Design an enzyme around this catalytic site. Structure first.
Site, PDB file in Angstrom:
ATOM      1  N   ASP A   1      33.888   1.148 -20.607  1.00 42.29           N
ATOM      2  CA  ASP A   1      34.259  -0.282 -20.595  1.00 42.29           C
ATOM      3  C   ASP A   1      34.928  -0.757 -19.308  1.00 42.29           C
ATOM      4  OD1 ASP A   1      33.432  -0.215 -23.281  1.00 42.29           O
ATOM      5  OD2 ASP A   1      35.468  -0.526 -24.111  1.00 42.29           O
TER       6      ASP A   1
ATOM      7  N   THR B   1      46.252  -1.702 -23.435  1.00 36.34           N
ATOM      8  CA  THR B   1      46.945  -1.017 -24.545  1.00 36.34           C
ATOM      9  C   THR B   1      48.361  -0.591 -24.062  1.00 36.34           C
ATOM     10  OG1 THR B   1      44.912  -0.280 -25.614  1.00 36.34           O
ATOM     11  CG2 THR B   1      46.868   1.099 -25.999  1.00 36.34           C
TER      12      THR B   1
ATOM     13  N   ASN C   1      37.896   4.965 -23.715  1.00 42.82           N
ATOM     14  CA  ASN C   1      37.085   4.544 -22.571  1.00 42.82           C
ATOM     15  C   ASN C   1      36.203   5.658 -21.977  1.00 42.82           C
ATOM     16  OD1 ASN C   1      39.200   2.360 -22.788  1.00 42.82           O
ATOM     17  ND2 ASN C   1      37.791   1.540 -21.323  1.00 42.82           N
TER      18      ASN C   1
ATOM     19  N   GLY D   1      31.828  -6.823 -31.676  1.00 43.40           N
ATOM     20  CA  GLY D   1      30.435  -6.803 -32.092  1.00 43.40           C
ATOM     21  C   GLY D   1      30.056  -5.357 -32.387  1.00 43.40           C
TER      22      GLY D   1
ATOM     23  N   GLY E   1      35.575  -5.540 -33.785  1.00 44.73           N
ATOM     24  CA  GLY E   1      35.683  -6.995 -33.837  1.00 44.73           C
ATOM     25  C   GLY E   1      34.846  -7.659 -32.753  1.00 44.73           C
TER      26      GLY E   1
ATOM     27  N   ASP F   1      41.791   0.189 -17.705  1.00 39.29           N
ATOM     28  CA  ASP F   1      41.582   0.421 -19.135  1.00 39.29           C
ATOM     29  C   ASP F   1      41.488   1.913 -19.545  1.00 39.29           C
ATOM     30  OD1 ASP F   1      41.384  -0.789 -21.652  1.00 39.29           O
ATOM     31  OD2 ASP F   1      39.224  -1.226 -21.475  1.00 39.29           O
TER      32      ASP F   1
ATOM     33  N   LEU G   1      25.949   3.123 -32.679  1.00 39.10           N
ATOM     34  CA  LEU G   1      26.819   4.062 -31.982  1.00 39.10           C
ATOM     35  C   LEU G   1      28.306   3.661 -32.151  1.00 39.10           C
ATOM     36  CD1 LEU G   1      24.600   4.268 -28.742  1.00 39.10           C
ATOM     37  CD2 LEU G   1      24.596   5.874 -30.625  1.00 39.10           C
ATOM     38  N   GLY G   2      28.577   2.373 -32.345  1.00 37.89           N
ATOM     39  CA  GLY G   2      29.936   1.878 -32.502  1.00 37.89           C
ATOM     40  C   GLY G   2      29.989   0.471 -33.052  1.00 37.89           C
TER      41      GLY G   2
ATOM     42  N   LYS H   1      41.950   5.383 -21.229  1.00 36.93           N
ATOM     43  CA  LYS H   1      42.428   5.952 -22.489  1.00 36.93           C
ATOM     44  C   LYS H   1      41.235   6.710 -23.075  1.00 36.93           C
ATOM     45  CE  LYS H   1      41.688   1.600 -24.968  1.00 36.93           C
ATOM     46  NZ  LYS H   1      41.817   0.516 -23.981  1.00 36.93           N
TER      47      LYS H   1
ATOM     48  N   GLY I   1       0.757  -1.253   0.000  1.00 32.17           N
ATOM     49  CA  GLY I   1       0.000   0.000   0.000  1.00 32.17           C
ATOM     50  C   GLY I   1       0.784   1.297   0.000  1.00 32.17           C
ATOM     51  N   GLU I   2       2.126   1.221   0.055  1.00 37.11           N
ATOM     52  CA  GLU I   2       3.068   2.353   0.145  1.00 37.11           C
ATOM     53  C   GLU I   2       2.875   3.497  -0.863  1.00 37.11           C
ATOM     54  OE1 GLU I   2       3.816  -0.968  -0.438  1.00 37.11           O
ATOM     55  OE2 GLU I   2       5.847  -1.154  -1.277  1.00 37.11           O
ATOM     56  N   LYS I   3       2.212   3.283  -2.018  1.00 33.16           N
ATOM     57  CA  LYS I   3       1.973   4.409  -2.941  1.00 33.16           C
ATOM     58  C   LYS I   3       0.988   5.429  -2.293  1.00 33.16           C
ATOM     59  CE  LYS I   3       4.203   2.677  -6.725  1.00 33.16           C
ATOM     60  NZ  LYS I   3       4.449   1.249  -7.063  1.00 33.16           N
TER      61      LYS I   3
HETATM   62  O1  LIG Z   1       7.230   5.406   1.147  1.00 32.04           O
HETATM   63  C1  LIG Z   1       7.101   4.847   2.447  1.00 32.04           C
HETATM   64  C2  LIG Z   1       8.442   4.418   3.011  1.00 32.04           C
HETATM   65  O2  LIG Z   1       8.727   3.211   2.262  1.00 32.04           O
HETATM   66  C3  LIG Z   1       9.020   1.944   2.910  1.00 32.04           C
HETATM   67  C4  LIG Z   1       7.944   0.954   2.518  1.00 32.04           C
HETATM   68  C5  LIG Z   1       7.894   0.778   1.002  1.00 32.04           C
HETATM   69  C6  LIG Z   1       9.255   0.425   0.442  1.00 32.04           C
HETATM   70  N1  LIG Z   1      10.295   1.429   0.858  1.00 32.04           N
HETATM   71  C7  LIG Z   1      11.594   1.157   0.158  1.00 32.04           C
HETATM   72  C8  LIG Z   1      11.618   1.573  -1.299  1.00 32.04           C
HETATM   73  N2  LIG Z   1      11.838   2.846  -1.568  1.00 32.04           N
HETATM   74  C9  LIG Z   1      11.773   2.937  -2.958  1.00 32.04           C
HETATM   75  C10 LIG Z   1      11.914   4.038  -3.802  1.00 32.04           C
HETATM   76  C11 LIG Z   1      11.781   3.857  -5.173  1.00 32.04           C
HETATM   77  C12 LIG Z   1      11.478   2.605  -5.698  1.00 32.04           C
HETATM   78  C13 LIG Z   1      11.320   1.502  -4.865  1.00 32.04           C
HETATM   79  C14 LIG Z   1      11.497   1.682  -3.499  1.00 32.04           C
HETATM   80  N3  LIG Z   1      11.417   0.827  -2.413  1.00 32.04           N
HETATM   81  C15 LIG Z   1      10.384   1.500   2.370  1.00 32.04           C
HETATM   82  C16 LIG Z   1      11.495   2.312   2.978  1.00 32.04           C
HETATM   83  C17 LIG Z   1      12.214   1.822   4.064  1.00 32.04           C
HETATM   84  C18 LIG Z   1      13.193   2.592   4.670  1.00 32.04           C
HETATM   85  C19 LIG Z   1      13.458   3.865   4.208  1.00 32.04           C
HETATM   86  C20 LIG Z   1      12.751   4.365   3.133  1.00 32.04           C
HETATM   87  C21 LIG Z   1      11.780   3.591   2.514  1.00 32.04           C
HETATM   88  C22 LIG Z   1       8.423   4.231   4.508  1.00 32.04           C
HETATM   89  C23 LIG Z   1       9.617   4.510   5.164  1.00 32.04           C
HETATM   90  C24 LIG Z   1       9.695   4.358   6.532  1.00 32.04           C
HETATM   91 CL1  LIG Z   1      11.217   4.628   7.323  1.00 32.04          CL
HETATM   92  C25 LIG Z   1       8.616   3.966   7.290  1.00 32.04           C
HETATM   93  C26 LIG Z   1       7.433   3.709   6.628  1.00 32.04           C
HETATM   94 CL2  LIG Z   1       6.027   3.264   7.558  1.00 32.04          CL
HETATM   95  C27 LIG Z   1       7.324   3.818   5.254  1.00 32.04           C
END
Ligand SMILES: OC[C@H](O[C@H]1CCCN(Cc2nc3ccccc3[nH]2)[C@H]1c1ccccc1)c1cc(Cl)cc(Cl)c1
Ligand SMILES: [Cl-]
Length: 467
Positions: A298, A317, A285, A168, A166, A280, A162-163, A282, A87-89
Site C-alpha cells: 500500500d 497507525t 503492508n 472495498g 471497509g 505506512d 485475497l482481502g 507495518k 520492423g524491429e521484430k
Molecule cells: O531491437 C532493436 C533495437 O530496438 C530499437 C528499435 C525498436 C524499439 N527499441 C526500444 C524498445 N525496446 C523494447 C523492449 C521490449 C518492449 C518494447 C520495447 N521497445 C529500440 C531501442 C533503442 C535503444 C536501445 C534499445 C532499443 C535497436 C537498438 C539500437 Cl541501439 C539500434 C537499433 Cl538499429 C535497433
C-alpha cells in the site's frame, strides 16, 4: 563517407530514443546504416512477407495497415514519419511480417539487417553495453503501459478474494486472453475515499505505484474507473499476507526477521533514491510472493517530497508514527528508518514497543523514547542495537539519514553474513517457503465471504479524471 556519416550521426541525435545513447554506438550505427528509397504508394513491407531488415524513417511518411483475415478489408493502424521506425521484430529472428508499410509520399529509410545489427551488438563490455541495456529496459515500460492500455475490466475473470475491508476488497483476477497471467485487482469504494478525505492520498498512490520498478514493491500496471469503484491492477503475490504468517507463527526468528527487514531496506533504498517517503510500514503492508520474497503493497500514505524539504501531514497507525510527526515538526525520508526499528521489534516479539489504550496514550510512550524501554531477552544484542540506532528521537541522528545513507543500515553488525547481492539477484533462499500449486492458488490467504451487501453511492465529482 565522412559527410554522410556525420549526417546520419546528426540525424540519430534528433531521434527520440536513439539520442540518449553513447556516441560510440551512434557512430558504429552511422558506419553500417544503408539508405533505401521509395516513391508514393510503394510497399516497404508487405504483410505475411519474411524479413530480416529494420527501418528508421529519415524523409517522408508511411501508412501502417493490417488485414485481420483473408476475406476482410485491411484496417488502417497509424501514419509514421521522420524519426519513427518499424520492423524491429525482424532483428530478433521473427521473419513473418504482421502489418503492411506503404509509402505515403517520397520516403527514405536508414536500414540495418539482423546480421549487421547482431554484429554491431558486441561493443565495449560495460561502456557501450551499459547504456544500451538500460535504454532497452527504460523503453519496455512505455510498451507495458500500451499493452494494459488496450484492455478493459471486461477482459478479466474473478478467481477468488485475497482481502476485504471497509475500503472495498482485493480480488484475484485472471486475464481472459491468458489463463497463466493472474493479477491482484484492488477494488475501492469511492464514497469511502471521499468520506475519509483520501482523494489526493489515492491520486498520489496511482502516480507512485505505476512509476515504481522495484522487485521489493508490488507492481501497479494500470487503473480503471466507473461511477462507484476505482480498480487497481497489480501483480499477484500468492505467498500470503505477512501479518497472517506472523499471526499464525506468533513471532519470527532473528534470521527470518533479517530476510524481511532486508527486503524493506532495498524497497526503502529505491523509494528514498526518488525522494519518496513511505510512512505506512507495518506487517499489514508486506506480502510474500510464490518464492517467499517480500514486497510493500500500500502506497496510500506515501508522498513525493523534494530534496531538503519536509512534509507535515499527521497520518498512520499510532504504533508506527515517528516523534517528529507527533510533534508537528516536519518530517522526511528519515521517518521510514524509525518504522524499520519498530517493524524489527514487532517481528521478533509479535508486539510493537510503544502501545497505549488509545492514540494519545500511545503517542505519549513514543515520546519517552526507545532508551526508556526494556528489550526482551528474545531480541538478540545486535538486533536491539540496530533498533535503538533506527529509533533515535532526532531524525538527523538516525541510522540511514547519516553520512552514508541506507549503506549504514546495510553495513550494520546484525547484517554480517547477510548476502545482500543474492537477495537483489533473487538467489538467496527465503526463510518461509510458501506452497503455491498454480497462479490460481489462494490457499495461503484467509477465506472471505462473497459481497452480499448493495453497492455504494455513485461519485461523478471528477477527482478520478486520471484513473
Ligand atoms: O531491437 C532493436 C533495437 O530496438 C530499437 C528499435 C525498436 C524499439 N527499441 C526500444 C524498445 N525496446 C523494447 C523492449 C521490449 C518492449 C518494447 C520495447 N521497445 C529500440 C531501442 C533503442 C535503444 C536501445 C534499445 C532499443 C535497436 C537498438 C539500437 Cl541501439 C539500434 C537499433 Cl538499429 C535497433
Ligand atoms: Cl519490478
Amino acid at each position: 563517407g565522412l559527410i554522410k556519416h556525420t549526417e546520419y550521426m546528426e540525424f540519430l541525435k534528433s531521434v527520440p530514443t536513439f539520442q540518449s545513447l553513447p556516441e560510440e554506438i551512434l557512430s558504429k550505427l552511422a558506419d553500417v546504416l544503408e539508405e533505401t528509397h521509395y516513391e508514393n504508394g510503394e510497399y516497404i513491407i508487405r504483410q505475411g512477407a519474411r524479413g530480416d531488415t529494420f527501418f528508421i524513417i529519415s524523409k517522408g511518411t508511411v501508412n501502417v495497415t493490417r488485414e485481420d483475415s483473408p476475406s476482410e478489408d485491411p484496417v488502417f493502424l497509424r501514419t509514421l514519419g521522420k524519426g519513427d521506425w518499424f520492423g524491429e521484430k525482424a532483428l530478433q529472428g521473427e521473419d513473418v511480417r504482421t502489418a503492411n508499410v506503404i509509402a505515403a509520399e517520397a520516403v527514405t529509410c536508414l536500414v540495418i539487417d539482423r546480421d549487421s545489427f547482431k554484429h554491431l551488438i558486441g561493443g565495449l563490455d560495460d561502456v557501450s553495453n551499459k547504456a544500451y541495456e538500460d535504454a532497452e529496459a527504460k523503453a519496455k515500460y512505455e510498451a507495458e503501459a500500451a499493452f494494459f492500455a488496450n484492455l478493459k475490466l471486461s477482459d478479466f475473470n474473478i478467481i477468488d478474494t485475497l482481502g476485504v475491508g471497509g475500503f472495498g476488497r482485493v480480488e484475484l483476477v485472471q486475464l481472459k486472453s491468458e489463463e497463466s497471467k493472474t493479477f491482484a485487482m484492488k477494488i475501492l469504494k469511492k464514497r469511502h475515499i471521499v468520506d475519509t478525505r483520501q482523494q489526493e492520498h489515492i491520486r498520489s498512490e496511482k502516480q507512485i505505484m505505476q512509476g515504481a520498478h522495484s522487485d521489493f514493491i508490488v507492481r501497479l500496471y494500470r487503473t480503471f474507473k466507473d461511477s462507484k469503484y476505482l480498480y487497481m491492477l497489480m501483480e499477484a503475490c500468492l505467498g500470503g499476507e505477512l501479518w497472517t504468517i506472523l499471526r499464525d507463527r506468533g513471532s519470527f526468528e532473528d534470521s527470518t526477521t533479517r530476510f524481511y527487514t532486508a527486503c524493506v531496506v532495498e524497497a526503502f533504498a529505491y523509494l528514498h533514491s526518488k525522494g519518496i517517503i513511505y510512512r505506512d510500514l507495518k506487517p499489514e503492508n508486506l506480502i510474500l510472493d510464490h518464492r517467499g520474497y517480500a514486497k510493500l503493497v500500500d502506497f496510500g500514505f506515501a508522498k513525493k517530497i523534494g530534496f531538503g524539504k519536509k512534509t507535515w501531514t499527521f497520518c498512520g497507525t499510532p504504533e508506527y508514527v515517528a516523534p517528529e510527526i507527533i510533534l508537528n515538526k516536519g518530517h522526511d525520508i528519515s521517518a521510514d528508518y524509525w518504522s524499520l526499528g519498530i517493524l524489527m521489534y514487532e517481528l521478533l516479539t509479535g508486539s510493537p514497543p510503544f502501545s497505549g489504550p488509545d492514540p494519545m496514550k500511545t503517542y505519549n510512550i513514543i515520546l519517552r523514547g526507545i532508551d526508556m524501554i526494556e528489550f526482551p531477552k528474545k531480541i538478540a544484542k545486535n538486533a536491539a542495537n540496530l533498533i535503538k540506532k533506527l529509533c533515535r528521537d532526532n531524525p538527523s541522528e538516525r541510522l540511514g539519514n547519516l553520512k552514508n545513507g541506507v549503506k549504514d543500515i546495510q553495513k550494520h553488525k546484525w547484517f554480517e553474513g547477510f548476502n545482500w547481492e543474492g537477495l537483489r539477484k533473487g538467489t538467496l533462499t527465503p526463510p518461509i517457503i510458501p506452497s503455491v500449486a498454480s497462479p490460481t492458488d489462494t490457499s495461503n490467504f484467509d477465506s472471505f465471504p462473497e459481497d452480499n451487501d448493495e453497492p455504494p453511492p455513485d461519485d461523478n465529482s471528477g477527482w478520478d479524471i486520471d484513473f
